[PDB]
Amino acid sequence: EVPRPILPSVPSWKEAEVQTWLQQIGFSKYCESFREQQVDGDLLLRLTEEELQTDLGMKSGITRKRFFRELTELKTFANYSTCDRSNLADWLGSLDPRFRQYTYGLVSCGLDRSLLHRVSEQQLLEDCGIHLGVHRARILTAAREM
Amino acid sequence: PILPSVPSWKEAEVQTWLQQIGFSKYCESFREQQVDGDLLLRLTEEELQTDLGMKSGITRKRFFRELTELKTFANYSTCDRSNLADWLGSLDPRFRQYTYGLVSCGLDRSLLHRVSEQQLLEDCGIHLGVHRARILTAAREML
Amino acid sequence: RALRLLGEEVPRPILPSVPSWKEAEVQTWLQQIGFSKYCESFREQQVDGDLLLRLTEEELQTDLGMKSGITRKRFFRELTELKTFANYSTCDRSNLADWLGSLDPRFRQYTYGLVSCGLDRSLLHRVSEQQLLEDCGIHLGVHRARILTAAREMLHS
Amino acid sequence: VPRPILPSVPSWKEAEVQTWLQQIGFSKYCESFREQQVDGDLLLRLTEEELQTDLGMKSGITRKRFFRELTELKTFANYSTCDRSNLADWLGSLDPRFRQYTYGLVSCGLDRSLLHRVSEQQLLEDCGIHLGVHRARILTAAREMLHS
Amino acid sequence: RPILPSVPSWKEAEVQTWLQQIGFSKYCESFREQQVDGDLLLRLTEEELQTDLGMKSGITRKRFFRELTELKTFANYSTCDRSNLADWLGSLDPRFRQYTYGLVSCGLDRSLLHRVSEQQLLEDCGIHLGVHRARILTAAREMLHS
Amino acid sequence: PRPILPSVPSWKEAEVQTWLQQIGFSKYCESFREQQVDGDLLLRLTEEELQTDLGMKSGITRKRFFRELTELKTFANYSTCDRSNLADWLGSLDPRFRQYTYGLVSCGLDRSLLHRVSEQQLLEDCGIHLGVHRARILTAAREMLH
Amino acid sequence: PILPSVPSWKEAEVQTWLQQIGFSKYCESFREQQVDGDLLLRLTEEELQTDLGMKSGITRKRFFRELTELKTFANYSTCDRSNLADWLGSLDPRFRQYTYGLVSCGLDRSLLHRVSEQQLLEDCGIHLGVHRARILTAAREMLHS
Amino acid sequence: PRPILPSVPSWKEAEVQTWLQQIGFSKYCESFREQQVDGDLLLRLTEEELQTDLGMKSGITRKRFFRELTELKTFANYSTCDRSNLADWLGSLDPRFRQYTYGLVSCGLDRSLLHRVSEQQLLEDCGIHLGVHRARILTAAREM
Secondary structure, three states: OOOOOOOOOHHHOOHHHHHHHHHHOOOHHHHHHHHHOOOOHHHHHOOOHHHHHHHOOOOOHHHHHHHHHHHHHHHHOOOOOOOOOOOHHHHHHHHOHHHHHHHHHHHHOOOOHHHHOOOOHHHHHHOOOOOOHHHHHHHHHHHHHO | OOOOOHHHOOHHHHHHHHHHOOOHHHHHHHHHOOOOHHHHHOOOHHHHHHHOOOOOHHHHHHHHHHHHHHHHOOOOOOOOOOOHHHHHHHHOHHHHHHHHHHHHOOOOHHHHOOOOHHHHHHOOOOOOHHHHHHHHHHHHOOO | OOOHHHOOOOOOOOOOOHHHOOHHHHHHHHHHOOOHHHHHHHHHOOOOHHHHHHOOHHHHHHHOOOOOHHHHHHHHHHHHHHHHOOOOOOOOOOOHHHHHHHHOHHHHHHHHHHHHOOOOHHHHOOOOHHHHHHHOOOOOHHHHHHHHHHHHOOOOO | OOOOOOOOHHHOOHHHHHHHHHHOOOHHHHHHHHHOOOOHHHHHOOOHHHHHHHOOOOOHHHHHHHHHHHHHHHHOOOOOOOOOOOHHHHHHHHOHHHHHHHHHHHHOOOOHHHHHHOOHHHHHHOOOOOOHHHHHHHHHHHOOOOOO | OOOOOOHHHOOHHHHHHHHHHOOOHHHHHHHHHOOOOHHHHHOOOHHHHHHHOOOOOHHHHHHHHHHHHHHHHHOOOOOOOOOOHHHHHHHHOHHHHHHHHHHHHOOOOOOOHHHOOHHHHHHOOOOOOHHHHHHHHHHHHOOOOO | OOOOOOOHHHOOHHHHHHHHHHOOOHHHHHHHHHOOOOHHHHHHOOHHHHHHHOOOOOHHHHHHHHHHHHHHHHOOOOOOOOOOOHHHHHHHHOHHHHHHHHHHHHOOOOHHHHHHOOHHHHHHOOOOOOHHHHHHHHHHHHOOOO | OOOOOHHHOOHHHHHHHHHHOOOHHHHHHHHHOOOOHHHHHOOOHHHHHHHOOOOOHHHHHHHHHHHHHHHHOOOOOOOOOOOHHHHHHHHOHHHHHHHHHHHHOOOOHHHHOOOOHHHHHHOOOOOOHHHHHHHHHHHHOOOOO | OOOOOOOHHHOOHHHHHHHHHHOOOHHHHHHHHHOOOOHHHHHOOOHHHHHHHOOOOOHHHHHHHHHHHHHHHHOOOOOOOOOOOHHHHHHHHOHHHHHHHHHHHHOOOOHHHHHHOOHHHHHHOOOOOOHHHHHHHHHHHHOO
C-alpha cells in the first residue's frame, strides 16, 4: 500500500510528481493548493507547518500531522544522490534508519560529512529543521566523533 | 483478555471505541479528521479542543481519562521491539501509557539512559513532572 | 474534643468516599452547601468524585459558569472541607493522608493531588517545589514549604 | 454576652456584614454583598480585584474608602476562635496597626512557632501584606522568634 | 494663605473650599461625588486623579499636584504625626515636609525611619524623586535616637 | 525695561503666548492657553504632554518645538530658582548644558549636593536624555570641591 | 556566459529578469516601487511581502531561490575592490551570494578578520547560522594586517 | 551635475524642496512643506518620522530615500556646526563615515571628546546603526 515509485528522486521531482504523490497518500483534496503554489520536490522537502497551514490551507493540526506522517515516510526512503555528494544519507541511516529523513535539511545548508563535526544544536534546529530534541542530541553526539 | 493493537487501529476501530466509552457525540469529528490508532495515541489537548471541537476542559479530562485506560491496556508489540511497555509497567502500571510517546521518538531500552527531562516533556508528551522524574531516575540506573 | 463533625452544619455523610462518588452524590453535596444553582452545570458536565476533587479555578469559571471570584472562593472553601475529611482508602495505599494530617490536619486536603501524580510515602522525599505546585496543585507557598521541609527529613533509611 | 466590644468578624454571617455596610455608609453595596454571599470569612479575605469586578466598586477612591473601614475593623476584631497561638497580640506588640494582618497569617496556617521560617514572598502572596515597610518589620521581628 | 491647616482631619467641605481657592472649582463636583476628604486628598495618585476624578490632561494634573505640594508643605500633621517627622523633614529641606503623610501613613516615625529602603520610599510612601529619596535616606541613617 | 536673558521660570501664560507667536507656533496658542501653560510648566514640558495634552501630533513638529525650547532654556535667567548658580557651573562645562538648569534645581540639587548625584537621577529626575551629556556632567560632578 | 552587473542594474533590467524567471505577475509592483539592482540585491522577506505584495511564503521561497541564483553568478567588480566575491566562492560557490551584503557595510578582505557573528547576521544579512560560522572561521584564519 | 559642498545644516525649507525635486521625490514635496522640514530636520530624519509624519508608507521607498540622504550627508558642508572638523576626520577613516558628522556634532562631540565615546553613545545618541561602522569609528577614536 506504499506509494509508487519506491525510493524516488524527490529532489528532482516537478509539480506533476508531487501531484501524483498527493493522490497516492489520499490528499487529492489539496492537489489544487499545491498546484497553485507550484510545489515541486525541493519545496515539498522543505515544507513547514506554517506554509502548510497558511499558504496551502491545511487548517487542521491533525490533518497536518497526517500529512507530515506521509512526508516523513517519503523523506526516509528518498534518493538524495543528486544533492548528497558525501552520502550523509547513509551516515544518518547508520545511526538510525529514521534519521535519513533529515538528509535534505543538512545538505540544503551545505553541510557534508567533513563539516558535520562543527555543527551546533541551534544550527540543527533552526537551519536544518530537526525539531525532535532526542534526534538532535543523537545526531550531535555522533557528529562530534566521526 | 487480549489487549487491542491500538497502533494498527483504523478509523473504524476508533469509531467503535468512541461508542463504547460514551463519546458517540464526537464520532463525526473523529471521522472528518480521519483519526486512526496512531493519531488517537498522539492526540493533544490542543487538537482535541480546536480540531475535534471538544470545548469543555472537563469533557477533555473525561476523554483523556478513557484514553489513558486504553493506552494502559494496549498491545504495542508491533512498534515496541525492546519491550519498553513492560519496563514502564514494572516501574508503575500507570507508566505503560507512555509507551507510544517513547517509541514514536525512536527510543528503546538501550537509548533511554541518555534522555533528558526536556525531551520527556516536549518530545514524548509526559506532562506530569513526578512521572518524568521517576522514569528519568530509573533510566539512569539501568545503564 | 473540638469535633464539629457531629454538628448539624457539616454536610452528611461525614467521612465520605468522594473518589468513588458518582454524579448523584456530587448533586447531593452541592445542595447541602447551598450551591443548588450550579447543579445543572455539574450534571451537564458529568462531574463525578474524581473530577470534583481535581476541579480547577479555570474549569469552575469557564466550564461550570461560576463567573464570580468570590463565589469560586466560597466553593473552594467548601471543597477544601470535603477534601479534608474524605476517605481516600481506595486510592491511598501508603496512607499519605495520615502523613499529611500529622504535619497539620488541614494538609490532608492535598491527599488526592499527591496520589493522582503517583506519589507515595517512599517517593515523597524526592519531590520538588515545582512538582508540589504544578503537579499536585498546592497553591499556598506556606503549605508547599512545610510539606517540602517535612519530606526532606523523612527516613528512607 | 449580648454586645461584645471587639467584634468576632471571623464568625460573622451575611446579616452582620450587611449591618456593618450600613453603619459605614456603604448601603449602596448591600445588594451586591448579599448576592455574592459575603460572610465574615470572605469579608476579611476580600481583595481589590473582588471588590472591583465581583462587587462592582469601579472607583479606586471608593475602594480606598472601603478598605479604610475594613482595615479599622480588621485591626480591632476578635480572632480568638481562629488564632490559637495569639498572633494578634504578637503583631499588635510590634505596632497596633499590624493586628490587621492576623487573619491573613492564620488563614495560611501560620502560628507563633512557624513564624521564624516565613519568607518575604509568603507574606506578600499568601498573607496579603502589600506594604513593604510592614513586611520588613514583621520579617525582622520574626527572626527573633523560637521555632520547633 | 492658610496657616497650619489640619488637612488630615479635613472633611469634604474643606476640600471643596480648597479647590475653589486654588482655581480648581471645575473639579468640585467630581471630588464631591467621590467623597474626597483630607485623608484621601493627601494620598491622591495620578491614576485616581485621571480615572476617578476625570482630570484627563497631564498638564492639568501637574498644576494640581503643584498646588497639593504647597498645601502638604504647610499642613498641620499633629493628629497623625506623634514623633514630629514633619519638622525633621522640613529641617533637612522645606520641600521634604510634603512627604510627612506618606511616611506616617505607613506607620513610620523618627525612630523607624533608618530601616526604610529607597524602594519602600517610592512604592510605600510615594516619594517619586530619586534625589529626594536618597537625601532622606542618608539623613535617616545619621540621626540621633533614644 | 527689557532684560537680555528672559526670566522664564517667572513667566506667566501671557509671556508663553508671546513666545509661541515669535517662534511661529501661533497655531498652538489656544491649546497652551486652555492648558494654562506658564513658565514653570513650559520648562518642564514632556514629549507626552506635547502630543496628548497640547495636540502636537507630528514628531517632526515636536522636534521643531523642542529645538526652540532648548534654545530658550539655554539662555534663560534662572536666578530666582538657582541660588547656588548651577547654571554657570553647567555653562562652564559646555554652554549647551545650561539647558539642564531647571531640571537640576527642580529636584532640589545645588552645587553642594551635586557630587552625590547618580546616573539614574540625572536621567529620571533631571531629564537628561543624552548619554554623552549625562556622562560629562556626572564626571565633572564627582571631581568637585565639597 | 557573461555575468550580469546586477549592482548597476536599472529598473528595466530588473523587469527583464522578472520575466525570465516567470515572475511577470510581479513586474507592476517592482516598477511601482522602483526596484533597481541595488534594491533587488538588498530585498528582505518583509519588503517582498508588504511592499511588493507577495503574500505566499512559498512564493517568496521560490523568489529567493531565483534571487540566490542571480546573486551567485553576478558581477560585483564595480563595488568589490578587494574581490570578496572570489574569497567567498573559494570557501563554497554558494557563499558568493553574500558579496553585496558584505561590501554594502564597507567590509573588504583586510577588515574581514575582525567581523563578529552579530555583524554577519544584522549588518550583512547572512541568515543561515551554518554559513555564518564557516565564513567567520575562514575569516579568522586570514592575513591579519 | 552633483552639488559641491552644500551647506545642508543651514538649508531652509526651500532648499530641501529643491533637493526633493532633484532626487525624484517631488511627490513628497507637499508633506515636507507642511511639516516644515529644513536642513537640520532633514539631517535628523528617522524611519518613524518618514513613515508616520511624512506619509512614506513603503519600506522600499524609504530605503531609496535614505540612499539619497546618505549621499547628501556624505558630500555636505558642515562648517557652521563642526568647529573641530570631525567631517574630515571621519572622511579620512572612510568617505562613507562622513555621513555621521551631524549625528556626532549634534551631541556636542568634537575631536578632543571623541576618544571617550562609548559604543552605546554612538548607537543611541549619534544614530550610527551599522555595527561595522561603530566598531571602526570606536577603534580609530581610541588611537588618536
